[PDB]
Amino acid sequence: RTLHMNLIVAVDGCGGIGRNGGMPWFLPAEMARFAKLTTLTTDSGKKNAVIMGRKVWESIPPKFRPLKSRFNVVLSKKMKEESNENVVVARSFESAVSLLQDMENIETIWNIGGREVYELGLNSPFLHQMYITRVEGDFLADVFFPRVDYGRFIKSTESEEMHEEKGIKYRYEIYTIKTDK
Numbered sequence: 001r002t003l004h005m006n007l008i009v010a011v012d013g014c015g016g017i018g019r020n021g022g023m024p025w026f027l028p029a030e031m032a033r034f035a036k037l038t039t040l041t042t043d044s045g046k047k048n049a050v051i052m053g054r055k056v057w058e059s060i061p062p063k064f065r066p067l068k069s070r071f072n073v074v075l076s077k078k079m080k081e082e083s084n085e086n087v088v089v090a091r092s093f094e095s096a097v098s099l100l101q102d103m104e105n106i107e108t109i110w111n112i113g114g115r116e117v118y119e120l121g122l123n124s125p126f127l128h129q130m131y132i133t134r135v136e137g138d139f140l141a142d143v144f145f146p147r148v149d150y151g152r153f154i155k156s157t158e159s160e161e162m163h164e165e166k167g168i169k170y171r172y173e174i175y176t177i178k179t180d181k
């Protein structure tokens with residue numbers, strides 16, 4: 001019945017998320033946490049879904065692609081269909097969300113973005129939480145997280161320390177839409 005769409009993203013001090021079609025940094029521990037958050041379900045035997053844009057799909061190393069143990073949905077008007085049964089190509093956000101809510105074995109939808117995919121998520125009735133990694137500094141991004149009104153959310157108050165790997169510092173944040181908390 002209740003179906004959550006959570007967003008997950010890492011943004012720099014300017015709100016940047018991408019540079020030259022890829023990520024402006026590489027943070028293996030942060031990536032491991034990403035994989036755990038998007039894969040783990042409470043009901044064993046249920047699966048999570050990730051919804052992403054074409055350029056996110058093209059930015060995943062083909063070894064890690066499709067993202068294991070998750071149902072992959074790629075938004076694209078130009079991409080040909082994917083033979084793999086863990087990947088479906090959807091032509092609109094509405095059709096992707098309808099397809100996902102039709103599937104009973106899907107527990108949570110993880111919106112892993114592309115700016116426009118994040119933007120559509122922020123207007124979705126299923127919007128629940130934002131898991132935002134805030135990375136310190138300006139990585140000269142050319143793609144940014146959407147403009148968002150944080151006044152719509154409650155920022156969780158659990159203790160959050162600084163992290164550092166590869167000389168790059170970051171901190172985790174969690175937001176819950178006010179109409180749920």
Ligand SMILES: NC(=O)c1ccc[n+]([C@@H]2O[C@H](COP(=O)([O-])OP(=O)(O)OC[C@H]3O[C@@H](n4cnc5c(N)ncnc54)[C@H](OP(=O)(O)O)[C@@H]3O)[C@@H](O)[C@H]2O)c1
Nearest residue numbers: 009010018021022023053054055056075076077078114115
């Ligand atoms: N740091 C992070 O957490 C993070 C997260 C996500 C992405 N990134 C980075 O950001 C860049 C990718 O993001 P981006 O915003 O440039 O692109 P994106 O959203 O990943 O991909 C854009 C493409 O997705 C398709 N698309 C988007 N919305 C659609 C819709 N409503 N209906 C149908 N198709 C739709 C279209 O594909 P067609 O052109 O094929 O129609 C569009 O050209 C890369 O640099 C990536 O590494 C970083």
Ligand SMILES: N#Cc1ccc(CC(=O)O)c(NC(=O)c2ccc(Cc3c[nH]c4nc(N)[nH]c(=O)c34)cc2)c1
Nearest residue numbers: 008009010028031032034035060061064067068112133
């Ligand atoms: N170590 C490690 C490790 C282990 C397994 C996997 C695949 C998997 O999760 O199963 C990965 N990642 C990827 O193969 C991968 C690469 C790029 C992205 C873009 C992205 C979207 N939204 C995000 N939000 C956060 N915060 N960061 C991010 O990188 C992204 C997303 C996933 C890394």
